[PDB]
Ligand binder design. Sequence first.
Ligand SMILES: Nc1ncnc2c1ncn2[C@@H]1O[C@H](COP(=O)(O)OP(=O)(O)OP(=O)(O)O)[C@@H](O)[C@H]1O
Ligand SMILES: Nc1ncnc2c1ncn2[C@@H]1O[C@H](COP(=O)(O)OP(=O)(O)O)[C@@H](O)[C@H]1O
Ligand SMILES: Nc1ncnc2c1ncn2[C@@H]1O[C@H](COP(=O)(O)OP(=O)(O)O)[C@@H](O)[C@H]1O
Ligand SMILES: [Mg+2]
Ligand SMILES: [Mg+2]
Ligand SMILES: [Mg+2]
Lengths: 44, 39, 509, 347, 347
Amino acid sequence: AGQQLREAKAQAAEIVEQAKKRANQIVDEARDQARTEGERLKAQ
Amino acid sequence: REAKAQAAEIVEQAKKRANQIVDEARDQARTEGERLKAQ
Amino acid sequence: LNPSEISEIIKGRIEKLDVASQARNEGTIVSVSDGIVRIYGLADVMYGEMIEFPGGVYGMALNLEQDSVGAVVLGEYQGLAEGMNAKCTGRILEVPVGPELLGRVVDALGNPIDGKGPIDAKATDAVEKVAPGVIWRKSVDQPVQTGYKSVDAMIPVGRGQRELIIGDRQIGKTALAVDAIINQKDSGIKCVYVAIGQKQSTIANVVRKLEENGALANTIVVAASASESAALQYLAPYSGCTMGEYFRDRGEDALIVYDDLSKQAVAYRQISLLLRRPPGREAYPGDVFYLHSRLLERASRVSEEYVEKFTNGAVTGKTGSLTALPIIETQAGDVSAFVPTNVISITDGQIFLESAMFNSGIRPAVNAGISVSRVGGAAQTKIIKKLSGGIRTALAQYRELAAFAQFASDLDEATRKQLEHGQRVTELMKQKQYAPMSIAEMSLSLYAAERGFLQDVEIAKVGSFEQALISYFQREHAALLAKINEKGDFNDEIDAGIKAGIEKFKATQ
Amino acid sequence: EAPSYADQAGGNELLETGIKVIDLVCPFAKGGKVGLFGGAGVGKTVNMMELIRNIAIEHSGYSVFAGVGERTREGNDFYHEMKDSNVLDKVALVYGQMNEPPGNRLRVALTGLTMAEKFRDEGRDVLLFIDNIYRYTLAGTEVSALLGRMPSAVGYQPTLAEEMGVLQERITSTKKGSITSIQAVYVPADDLTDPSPATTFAHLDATVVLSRDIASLGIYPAVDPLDSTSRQLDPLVIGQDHYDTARGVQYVLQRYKELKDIIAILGMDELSEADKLLVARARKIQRFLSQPFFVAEVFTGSPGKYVSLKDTIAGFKGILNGDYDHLPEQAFYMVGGIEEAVEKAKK
Amino acid sequence: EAPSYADQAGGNELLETGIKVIDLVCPFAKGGKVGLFGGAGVGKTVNMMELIRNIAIEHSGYSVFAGVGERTREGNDFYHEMKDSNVLDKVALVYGQMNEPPGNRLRVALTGLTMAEKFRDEGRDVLLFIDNIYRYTLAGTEVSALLGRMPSAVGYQPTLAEEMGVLQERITSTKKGSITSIQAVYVPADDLTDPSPATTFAHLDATVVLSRDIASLGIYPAVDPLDSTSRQLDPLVIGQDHYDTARGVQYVLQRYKELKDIIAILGMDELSEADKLLVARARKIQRFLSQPFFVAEVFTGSPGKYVSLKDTIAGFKGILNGDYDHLPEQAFYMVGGIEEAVEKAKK
Ligand SMILES: Nc1ncnc2c1ncn2[C@@H]1O[C@H](COP(=O)(O)OP(=O)(O)OP(=O)(O)O)[C@@H](O)[C@H]1O
Ligand SMILES: Nc1ncnc2c1ncn2[C@@H]1O[C@H](COP(=O)(O)OP(=O)(O)O)[C@@H](O)[C@H]1O
Ligand SMILES: Nc1ncnc2c1ncn2[C@@H]1O[C@H](COP(=O)(O)OP(=O)(O)O)[C@@H](O)[C@H]1O
Ligand SMILES: [Mg+2]
Ligand SMILES: [Mg+2]
Ligand SMILES: [Mg+2]
């Protein structure tokens, strides 16, 4: 009973860490697209 | 069976937390769009 | 790229040319040295009056000797020469004022340096003024949230208070004041940042951080960089103060940051030695105390009667305020220096930053034993006032207890209880830069500590516990956080609501 | 001119303040001069406000309050406090704050004293309060060099001792009437050897010293029992029981000052059986000096306590004789009289 | 005049130096300013000559070197070294050494900077190196009293901060081109609180502080991790792995510095089981920060080492995690990368 709780708790931490890792990709890809469009408009 | 139920709830709360993190990241990335006027 | 428009703009200056004759008082330049100009003949020049030189260069009269006038140049002096005419304008130093300055970067005289166009302000005001007297003030009893729990819980700042930020080089003095400006974007408090003797790239980085955090539209930035005349660096804090006072006098609230009053004192010492005024305690002028006391006594809270009288009845039933956050740099922690000694004796409190705590990873680095707020609980909301009572003095006693019981054998329960609690509050006071907390977030963190919920939590897990607890209350108790954030109110219903949520959190996550 | 040598008074009537440390080691007297010495942020204004509350309000004569180089916010809070307390009809208020020119700060002390001298010369008993007398000296330093005077040691005006003597000798009780005075004395950089603080001690009857090291430990009022003193602390003026209690407290705290550095390097267990017991009493005495004031409720959160002379003596004799050796160290921190310490130990 | 506020550049691109302590706690950036602070004979010229060697590996543009008040022999050695190495056709050299009168030493800095500003304004990326920026200020002190100016603290000119700002603000990157600048700063009598060094810190992006106490133990470069810092040491610039490794090293070295007096009187054996392990790791970290240089080969004989940022982070992270608790303390001294410490321990 204790072993499966420790296993589930270890997987719970991994699920939340993968979500944090994913959030940074979502935010930095938006920054690079928005800055690139800003340069597209600035050159024109 | 109590250990099965608690392990299910521990992973359920983790999936609920993961969903919240990605939705907040979508709102941050959507708000980061201020660059359409700034610069 | 609009033609005709540029012409009519030029026609507007040609149409309004002062074609009539003027009666003026005049002199001649005798000597030009280190930003100081000596003149003969200005009989009606007043002290601190603006002097007009050829090519639109301006100076200020500081020494009215019997046979000569000593003036300081408000810009580059190397173009001036012996024999040039010096003229007299019957006006004291004035700068533009109003909401048109919000989101702009300007020099010590109010000229735009951001290249974002002209400032269509509709009001100028004198740079040097006397603060409102004893009878016109009102007691400080409204909060100014910095967003940091260590400051907002132990060293609170109220609307109209003056709180000094002091420490050595490179330990977060600018980071604390800039985060306090960022937290006001939704508070309804206008902001002013005065940069004295800083390099222009450091000023540009602070402005980029204000813009990236959405705080620039609510801030006026006054710059007097390291290459500018010592007169502009000496005047910049007074110009910024005058821009902040516009809101105070009209029943509104403002916040001002002087990033380095120790650099303003060094600029004033230069001018004074070049004017040949006799030196004091560290070659500093005799009146270096009055330099800072005349500036800092303007930051105040004014009564409804003062605002009603100033606005001729246009604004009623509202108080106005100007809150100040001056910064001072010490050398190797030495507070006995003349300038640090003066400023600590003028402000309504101080926040001491310690390099040993900063190197030890306590990054807000606030020494709770040396730091203090003279307004205390009157500058806090009901919830933070009750949840933070005695924390500052309890941490001060924990630091002493941790050193006294360091090598002794196992002590009684009273000693273990105090030591184990002080270690948890010490780890809790740690916060990251550009990450402010609302009243509800700080309240949950304070409640979980003072009500004993952290007693089962490991010291190395306090940060993770706080971050998870906040994230859980944000998803499952959003209506309670919204109720606490309306005015920071507290009662048995909110107390029980927080208790039930923290118990359910620890028992299930 | 100051009153002549033949006009000087000679009274020794003890004045109760309601503050434990002050009533124990620094007993005041009616018609005498008191100085509250301390650096920045240690309690000078707060202790002066508690003394005004415990003396000025209850008194039936006239008072003068002079704010010299004070914060304009403190002057507003005190005015509304005297007005709301219905005490204002007994007080003359003179204010010269830090935003005012050097000529004003150099003469406001003489204005307040001129009003007090008119009341004294009418045969009245008067109270004179001065929030910062250091600011009179500083205004002279700020202007001294522009007056063509060469500087002395530590950058002070050459006239430091005479400018101080010309003012301090007028603040006195005479055969006509009396002036009881409390002055707050700022100590530059916490150094009591600085020429200004050092020249001030000789002008006062009671010298109360506030310590930054005690304030840095959350203990309030932050008064140092070893450096503080009064002309009235004599068995022929008060009594042997009071004097023995005061010297007893001082002896215990003086011995503890050398042991503090020993315990920090070699630990508590290496001390003698008598030293271990004495250290525990010294740490308890150090905490029983603390007391929450009515004017400090906004800073402390807890309510204010007034303690009497007999209550103060009995509490300190109990800790010295060992009647409370069983109580925990934290029970004496912020608790008025000795009874409340016995009650705090149960919480 | 300096470039305007609207002409400023917001660059944060990391510059690898190949020197472990610098790349860990003092990360440099392209187009930024670096300062090397130190007393007499501690390593300013040797550490600058090693940086000149390492930055020229990736940089393809021009360089400008201004010799302000230093040894004439060192200017001759540097000129022939570059002439024999064929590097000379991409460097502009200006000299005003110690043998020169005050006017030369006062204006040589401006002459070298004027050549660097021409190349920056042409749209190029250039390096500007200054033999000692303190000599520009000192030449100003020798002449100040002759110019009729009243002296300030410790005899310095009253214009000290303005003379420094007028030069320092021109040494910057703009929207046209970039100037990466490195300057040696002499520290008078080892005092970092002296007005000249104290006024220089605010003009730099990265501050490298050298110590005589560290140089005395044998460690070269003699950098102090606790006093040295950079604007690039931010999680948003260098990533969390580098940032946490650097913060971990500083925490261990700070805690070891607090125990120095206890260890000196009672020795290491009296410390707790936790402090003993931390002191052992602090001693290994302190030795692993050392590195044999390709310009220092003449002094000892040992071959120079270039260590990448990846290898630097991996070594210190392993020592912090405890992956090397079994290897002897002398295995970390003078070895470049972490794998060489494992091979040195075999002897
Ligand atoms: N809360 C924090 N958490 C982590 N790091 C911090 C924190 N606050 C400040 N720092 C960091 O420490 C350094 C403090 O620099 P800052 O400019 O604010 O200090 P300063 O005293 O004003 O320095 P200076 O004397 O150059 O003006 C910066 O690298 C900053 O990012
Ligand atoms: N008796 C006291 N109880 C609690 N806090 C106190 C007390 N005395 C002083 N303090 C704290 O110290 C601060 C400084 O006291 P204050 O009298 O203003 O100092 P000073 O006049 O010596 O500069 C107060 O504002 C308060 O925060
Ligand atoms: N990296 C190093 N390795 C070995 N010895 C060094 C090193 N750096 C400096 N030293 C020693 O210190 C001396 C002085 O160094 P130098 O750079 O000339 O000092 P500074 O320029 O600071 O006066 C060198 O000649 C050498 O003996
Ligand atoms: Mg700063
Ligand atoms: Mg005071
Ligand atoms: Mg050398």
